[PDB]
């Protein structure tokens, strides 16, 4: 049986504040700029539509040097940091971005038509953009976040997959890495392996995987380390209703309609797809720049940062403004020439993480050691190399950032005022 | 007229919230006669359909509508959870 950490984790009266200075990220909104011949990334892809997964490193409270150490017995017990307060500061002005594709697979406008559309020739793709669905979310836990998305499932050993055959789906659980993309209105799927077309969605998600937090799975998690607190806010509506060019993969059963004739003799593509639109963004609806007091967790792990680690996942599309900056090739002619100017796109993100940590102690009795050992043997081994080297996240080092004077920091003042004593 | 269910939102979600069936407005206060229980649901706030198309040929570097078979699929994900209270009836 699993038990609340409140059972075996003792709470001291010591609190420390820790915060990143001010994280900054600048890059191209849709794709990374690199040397054609090369593969080294010159400019990275930085979009408001990517997940930001911060791997927070905390100083080992056992190796740490406290002014007083009488508060615990280093022989019978050990120390762990407990996250009690978080403030995800965001810094750019609110605004909405926009993504498209020069060759988006969009046949005709099916929202309203005055006459039957012509006939699909070869490549009827259009240059089209859209404002993605709005999403604000924040996940906190001592284990990285887990997402779900639809990918291409493995086929059954029978009927040989005829070329062009529809690929099988499979919900795939994955680890959400820093830089991954969020569902933008086309659901959470792997567009690379499910769309040979390469033109069904805008460039920025076009050959990526849009993942959705698997909240269900994470909360079911027995120990609940992956996430002990979260805030989600997503909204979306249909801006336009389109058709997909291409060829019928699956025909419309004729028992569903009466054959036409002349123009209506041939059925138009009924492979409709809508254009998303996350409406207006607003201050009143902000999730960030507000402190989160992680006092009672719904999981058994009540904010204990086992391994002196801490994960903070964030997605904020309420500051997705992309800025176009163009340089002139010549500063002479007083006559505009498109060609005299090179147009570019850049997007900036501004973060500022702040935390309030509470020192905790664990008396290593038999039972406790058995439990903690079963739960995560590494805990004890590390007490008296990176297991997630495969994954990549925004590394954040706070080992030199802890301060006992909450007083001197904004999140600190807030915490004191909130907790009174 | 053509309908349109406007924007969908988290704040308006009905699910992923627990429902405590303590006082029923009917005479049957949540008794599951026959050890049966019916849970009817309708949720159009996750109706996203995803189009997936496979290429008939992986050669030509020139788009041809005829080279790709377009399809449509939709996925639904549920997870039902209940808390039951044992009851007795003196016959």
């Amino acid at each position, epitope marked *: 049986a699993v038990v609340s950490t409140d059972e075996y984790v003792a709470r001291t009266n010591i609190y420390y504040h820790a915060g990143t200075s001010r994280l900054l990220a600048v890059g191209h909104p849709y794709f990374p700029i690199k040397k054609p011949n090369n593969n080294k990334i010159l400019v990275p892809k930085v979009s408001g539509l990517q997940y930001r997964v911060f791997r927070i490193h905390l100083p080992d409270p056992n190796k740490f040097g406290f002014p007083d150490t009488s508060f615990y017995n280093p022989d019978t017990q050990r120390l762990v940091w407990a996250c009690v307060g978080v403030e995800v500061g965001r810094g750019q002005p609110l605004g909405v971005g926009i993504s498209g594709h020069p060759l988006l697979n969009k046949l005709d406008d099916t929202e309203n038509a005055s006459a039957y559309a012509a*006939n699909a020739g070869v490549d009827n793709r259009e240059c089209i953009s859209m404002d993605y669905k709005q999403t604000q979310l924040c996940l906190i836990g001592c284990k990285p976040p887990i997402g779900e998305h639809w990918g291409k499932g493995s086929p059954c050993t029978q009927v*040989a997959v*005829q070329p*062009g055959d529809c690929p099988p789906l499979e919900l795939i659980n994955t680890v959400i890495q820093d830089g991954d993309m969020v569902d933008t209105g086309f659901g959470a799927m792997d567009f690379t392996t499910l769309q040979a077309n390469k033109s069904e969605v805008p460039l920025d998600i076009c050959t990526s995987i849009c993942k959705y937090p698997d909240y269900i799975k994470m909360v079911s998690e027995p120990y609940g380390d992956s996430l002990f607190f979260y805030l989600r806010r997503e909204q979306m509506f249909v801006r336009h209703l389109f058709n997909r060019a291409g*060829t019928v993969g699956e025909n419309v059963p004729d028992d569903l309609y009466i054959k036409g004739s*002349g123009s209506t*003799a041939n059925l138009a593509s009924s492979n409709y797809f809508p254009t998303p639109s996350g409406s207006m963004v607003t201050s009143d609806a902000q999730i960030f720049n507000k402190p989160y007091w992680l006092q009672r967790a719904q999981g058994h792990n009540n904010g204990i940062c086992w391994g002196n680690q801490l994960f903070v996942t964030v997605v904020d599309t309420t500051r997705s403004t992309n800025m176009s900056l163009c340089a002139a090739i010549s500063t002479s002619e007083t006559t505009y020439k498109n060609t005299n100017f090179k147009e570019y796109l850049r997007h900036g993100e501004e973060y500022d993480l702040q935390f309030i940590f509470q020192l905790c102690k664990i008396t290593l009795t038999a039972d406790v050691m058995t439990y903690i050992h079963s739960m995560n043997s590494t805990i004890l081994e590390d007490w008296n190399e990176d297991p997630l080297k495969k994954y990549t996240f925004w590394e954040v080092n706070l080992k030199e950032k802890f301060s006992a004077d909450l007083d001197q920091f904004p999140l600190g003042r807030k915490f004191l005022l909130q907790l009174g004593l | 007229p053509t309908p349109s269910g406007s924007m969908v939102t988290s704040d308006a979600q009905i699910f992923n919230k627990p429902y405590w069936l303590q006082r029923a407005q009917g005479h049957n206060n949540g008794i599951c006669w026959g050890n049966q229980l019916f849970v009817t649901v309708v949720d159009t706030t996750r109706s996203t359909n995803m189009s997936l198309c496979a290429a008939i040929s992986t050669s030509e570097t020139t788009y041809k509508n005829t080279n790709f078979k377009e399809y449509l699929r939709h996925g639904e994900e549920y997870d039902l959870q209940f808390i039951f209270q044992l009851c007795k009836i003196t016959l």
Partner: antibody, heavy 114, light 114 residues
Framework: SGAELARPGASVKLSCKAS????????MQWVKQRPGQGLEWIGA????????RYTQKFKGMATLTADKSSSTAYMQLTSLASEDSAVYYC??????????????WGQGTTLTVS | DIVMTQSPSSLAMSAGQKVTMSCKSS????????????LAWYQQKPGQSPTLLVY???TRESGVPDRFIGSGSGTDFTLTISSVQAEDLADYFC?????????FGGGTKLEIKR
């Protein structure tokens, strides 16, 4: 496929091998021409998805199928009678769900029922 | 079904004469969708398979001699050979490609006088 002699009451299956194009993208027609007579439409098949269309006259007489891996279309004629003795052609109408012209014809297969 | 009537059923002309053949449809072949008349003309020379001459009523297939002219619309179509040559000896057929079933006209047999 080559000329064929079958007896009344029997069945025959003739083939049409495609070449020179992405077979699975194009619809195939089958057409009947009796000795000294005109052309009659039998039916059409879309190898890519297996869809068939038949002239009411030939429903129950002709069965169309195709084999993607060999780019070959087949037509089976059952319950044969002397009325079925004729030259049979296979032909391509161009790619799509539209109703196009017949742009390529096979050399034809002569069926004698006797 | 849409019935197609070709006339005349046979025509004998000497080399250099203008040949006119008519084709009727029971229903209009004009699709307002792309404003085309879905009519094709085919040429079947002795011992050969039909060859496409004209489609969309008046569009000549590449490789077909320019003496072949298709025209007309709706229910009345014409295939003209401006100056008939000896090699034009053939049966000529019209076929609608407007909705199903596809039906063929009865054919015109063009013979050469000399």
């Amino acid at each position: 496929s080559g000329a064929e002699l079958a007896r009344p009451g029997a069945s025959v299956k003739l083939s049409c091998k495609a070449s020179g194009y992405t077979f699975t993208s194009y619809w195939m027609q089958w057409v009947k021409q009796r000795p000294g007579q005109g052309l009659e439409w039998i039916g059409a098949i879309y190898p890519g998805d297996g869809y068939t269309r038949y002239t009411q006259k030939f429903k129950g007489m002709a069965t169309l199928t195709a084999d993607k891996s060999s780019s070959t279309a087949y037509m089976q004629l059952t319950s044969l009678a002397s009325e079925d003795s004729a030259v049979y052609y296979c032909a391509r109408t161009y790619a799509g769900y539209y109703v196009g012209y017949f742009d390529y014809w096979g050399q034809g297969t002569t069926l004698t029922v006797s | 079904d849409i019935v197609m009537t070709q006339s005349p059923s046979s025509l004998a002309m000497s080399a250099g004469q203008k040949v006119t053949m008519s084709c009727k449809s029971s229903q209009s072949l004009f699709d307002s969708r792309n404003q085309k008349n879905y009519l094709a003309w085919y040429q079947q020379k002795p011992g050969q398979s039909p060859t496409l001459l004209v489609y969309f009523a008046s569009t000549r297939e590449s490789g077909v001699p320019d003496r072949f002219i298709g025209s007309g619309s709706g229910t009345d179509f014409t295939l003209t050979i401006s100056s008939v040559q000896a090699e034009d000896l053939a049966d000529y057929f019209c076929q609608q490609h407007y909705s199903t079933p596809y039906t063929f006209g009865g054919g015109t047999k063009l013979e050469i006088k000399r």
